[PDB]
Amino acid sequence: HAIFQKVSVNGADQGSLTGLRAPNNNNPVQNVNSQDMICGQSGSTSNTIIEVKAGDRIGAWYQHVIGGAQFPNDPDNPIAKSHKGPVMAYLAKVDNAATASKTGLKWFKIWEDTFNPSTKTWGVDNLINNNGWVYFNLPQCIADGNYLLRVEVLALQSAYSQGQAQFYQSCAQINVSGGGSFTPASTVSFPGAYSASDPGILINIYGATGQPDNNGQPYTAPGPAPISC
């Protein structure tokens, strides 16, 4: 249970919920056929469009509830340690990131932090060690203009049962300058890109001792692979 609720650009804090389409509550989306999969449950909206440069180092901030910890010494801030899984980030080009409908957009993945088997480290583990932040660079080659930037935590502690993977998603509204001429060879739809039977979604991550180490095996995230310039 957590909410992506703040963006940084080269370390510059854009402010709580600035530029975000974020859910009001921290409950997961679990039906991958749902429209809630695109930017999370419909919640807050923003008129701001965050100015970024292609190549910029983006930070996305998760906390347990809107505003941070739910109470002093919250064990589950930024997210509960049990919620092992990958973090993924996608872009969709839009004409106007403040007014574009989220329905039927053309998405492509730019970054993911999944699972390192020899260090036994999930993307959510790095999110936790980074105090809620995940960091990635926008590709240098993407074209100028508005985009929706969707960041997604997939928590797998219950994903051994059908439809019980948990997704925590929000979208950020950005405008890119200094870009290039890249166009993706292939895009995906949300909902639609993920199936409940995907090996990264219907999965038992529990090893012999009962620890969520995926039995030391490599993990395959759902969705397309990150693009490369």
Residues annotated as binding site? Answer: 1, 83, 168
Is 57 among the residues that bind Cu ion (CB under 5 A)? no
Annotated binding site for Cu(2+): 1, 83, 168
Closer CB to Cu ion, 3 or 227, in the complex: 3
Return the residue nearest Cu ion (CB atom).
Answer: 1
In whole angstroms, the minimum distance from the beta carbon of 100 to Cu ion comes to 29
The residues, ordered by sequence, that sit 6+ positions from 145 with a Cβ below 8 Å of its Cβ are 93, 95, 175, 176, 179
Residue 156 near residue 125, CB atoms below 8 Å: no
In whole angstroms, the minimum distance from the beta carbon of 84 to Cu ion comes to 11
Closer CB to Cu ion, 1 or 120, in the complex: 1
Closer CB to Cu ion, 146 or 166, in the complex: 166
User: Taking the alpha carbons of 153, 170, 141, 192 in that order, is the dihedral positive or negative?
Assistant: positive
Closer CB to Cu ion, 63 or 173, in the complex: 63
Kindly determine how many residues on this chain lie close enough to bind Cu ion according to the rule CB under 5 A. 1
Number of H helices, E strands in the chain: 1, 12
In whole angstroms, the minimum distance from the beta carbon of 6 to Cu ion comes to 19
Render the burial of 160-171: b for 16+ CB within 10 Å, e for the rest.
eeeebbbbbbbb
In whole angstroms, the minimum distance from the beta carbon of 3 to Cu ion comes to 11
Identify the three-state secondary structure at position 124.
Answer: helix
In whole angstroms, the minimum distance from the beta carbon of 82 to Cu ion comes to 8
Residue among 1, 57, 102, 120 that touches Cu ion (CB under 5 A): 1
Token readout for 141 is 């080659």
Burial of 228 (0-12, 13-18, 19+ CB in 10 A): exposed
Of 1-9, 119-127, 133-141, 198-206, the window that binds Cu ion (rule: CB under 5 A) is 1-9
Q: Is the link from the previous residue into 78 a cis peptide, with omega within 30 of 0?
A: yes
Residue 210 near residue 185, CB atoms below 8 Å: no
Closer CB to Cu ion, 14 or 63, in the complex: 63
Rounded CA-CA distance 74/194 in Å is 32
Closer CB to Cu ion, 1 or 53, in the complex: 1
Give the binding site for Cu ion (CB under 5 A). Answer: 1
